[PDB]
Amino acid sequence: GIGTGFPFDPHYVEVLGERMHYVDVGPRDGTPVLFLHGNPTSSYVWRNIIPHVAPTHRCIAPDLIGMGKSDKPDLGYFFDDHVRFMDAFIEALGLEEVVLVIHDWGSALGFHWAKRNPERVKGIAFMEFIRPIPTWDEWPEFARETFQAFRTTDVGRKLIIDQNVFIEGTLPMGVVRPLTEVEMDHYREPFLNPVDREPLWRFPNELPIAGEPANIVALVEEYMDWLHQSPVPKLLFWGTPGVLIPPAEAARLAKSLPNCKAVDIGPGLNLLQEDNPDLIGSEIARWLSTLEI
Ligand SMILES: [Cl-]
């Protein structure tokens, strides 16, 4: 079925004194497509979408600082930490104009960068992105208790850091189809050492849920407003029931956002890339052929 291997040559770039691993494939002459993963994934999540796009466009898929095959310094791994490291990563590869393909926390990165560099973003494909969740009722009920547990300095760290629940439990619960043992091992590899699991816990404590953290809420609201006011070509993927984006919200945004094409990928939760990579890749490639890049 959905291939579990990772047939990509490892690329490394030094960013603020640390090395960041990244996938780099495709032609070098045009505009490149930058793939940003989230929590608790790596560039491995893009492994079955990239081969659809590589024939025609450059694919760049970094592992976030502290995750995947990137270096893992002793940082707090707040959202701002990733913002600094991703700005410096984009400048280290001398990328001028890019097309964004962003998911989960990568979306919060991508969108934020796009707000600060409007002339440099030729297109944004996004899925299960970070939006402001006004109350806990807008969070899916089946996960509502668990993320509330995750957002505590005592119980949450025992779950995510000591017992590694975000990798062993939450991650498969974010995919409709079952993850194979090879896939689980690939996702487990960067966090075999518990001390390296700080990012797995800080991200859910950065989620803009119920107005906290206030700075993250403001930051996210700002680029959501910028998105509602930008003419950038937009491609939005959504699934049922979803996690961050329920179908109702996706439908709303499909009309409220300028130049927005929506694509229903079928059953999905949060890692839509794992439930229907074929459709996402084919749609991204066809969408890319319609841009002026
Ligand atoms: Cl999270």
| Domain of residue 285, residue span | 10-290
What whole-number distance in Å separates Cα of residue 158 and Cα of residue 170?
Answer: 14
Q: Name the strand (E) or helix (H) holding 148.
A: helix 141-150
What whole-number distance in Å separates Cα of residue 133 and Cα of residue 206?
Answer: 12
* 88 and 20 Cβ atoms separated by less than 8 Å: no
Structure tokens at 15: 């960013």
Distance of CA 21 from the midpoint of ligand 1 (Å):
21
Distance of CA 207 from the midpoint of ligand 1 (Å):
6
Distance of CA 28 from the midpoint of ligand 1 (Å):
33
Instruction: Answer yes or no: is 4 within a domain.
Output: no
Which residues on adjacent β-strands are paired with residue 197?
none
**Residue 97 exposed, middle or buried by CB count within 10 Å (0-12, 13-18, 19+):** middle
Instruction: Answer yes or no: is 61 within a domain.
Output: yes
Amino acid at 260: C
Report CA torsion sign: 276, 278, 279, 283: positive
Q: Which of 124, 173, 118 is nearest to 150 (CA)?
A: 173
Distance of CA 286 from the midpoint of ligand 1 (Å):
30
Distance of CA 181 from the midpoint of ligand 1 (Å):
23
Would you give the DSSP letter of residue 198? Answer: H
Using DSSP bridges, classify how beta strands 234-241 and 98-104 pair: parallel, antiparallel or unpaired.
unpaired
- In the chain, how many domains are there? 1
Which CATH number does the domain housing residue 147 bear?
A: 3.40.50.1820
Task: Please tell me whether residue 284 adopts helix, strand or coil conformation.
Answer: helix
What whole-number distance in Å separates Cα of residue 54 and Cα of residue 101?
Answer: 13
Distance of CA 271 from the midpoint of ligand 1 (Å):
12
Would you give the DSSP letter of residue 179? Answer: P
Structural determination approach: X-ray
Instruction: Answer yes or no: is 44 within a domain.
Output: yes
List of residues 6+ apart from 173 with CB closer than 8 A: 143, 269
Instruction: Answer yes or no: is 95 within a domain.
Output: yes
Most distant CA atoms of the chain, gap in Å: 51
Instruction: Answer yes or no: is 232 within a domain.
Output: yes
Distance of CA 47 from the midpoint of ligand 1 (Å):
21
Distance of CA 293 from the midpoint of ligand 1 (Å):
32
Instruction: Answer yes or no: is 3 within a domain.
Output: no
What whole-number distance in Å separates Cα of residue 223 and Cα of residue 33?
Answer: 20
Cα–Cα–Cα angle for 168, 217, 133, rounded to 5 degrees: 60
Distance of CA 202 from the midpoint of ligand 1 (Å):
8
Structure tokens at 51: 């081969």
Which residues on adjacent β-strands are paired with residue 240?
267
Distance of CA 104 from the midpoint of ligand 1 (Å):
8
Distance of CA 157 from the midpoint of ligand 1 (Å):
13
Structure tokens at 171: 């991650």
Distance of CA 168 from the midpoint of ligand 1 (Å):
14
What was the resolution (in A) of this experimentally determined structure? 3.1
What whole-number distance in Å separates Cα of residue 77 and Cα of residue 66?
Answer: 8
Q: How far apart are the first and last CA of the chain?
A: 33
What whole-number distance in Å separates Cα of residue 68 and Cα of residue 62?
Answer: 9
Q: Which of 269, 222, 265, 223 is nearest to 243 (CA)?
A: 269
Instruction: Answer yes or no: is 279 within a domain.
Output: yes
What whole-number distance in Å separates Cα of residue 155 and Cα of residue 171?
Answer: 19
Instruction: Answer yes or no: is 130 within a domain.
Output: yes
Structure tokens at 70: 């990137």
What whole-number distance in Å separates Cα of residue 113 and Cα of residue 117?
Answer: 6
Distance of CA 203 from the midpoint of ligand 1 (Å):
4
What whole-number distance in Å separates Cα of residue 237 and Cα of residue 113?
Answer: 20
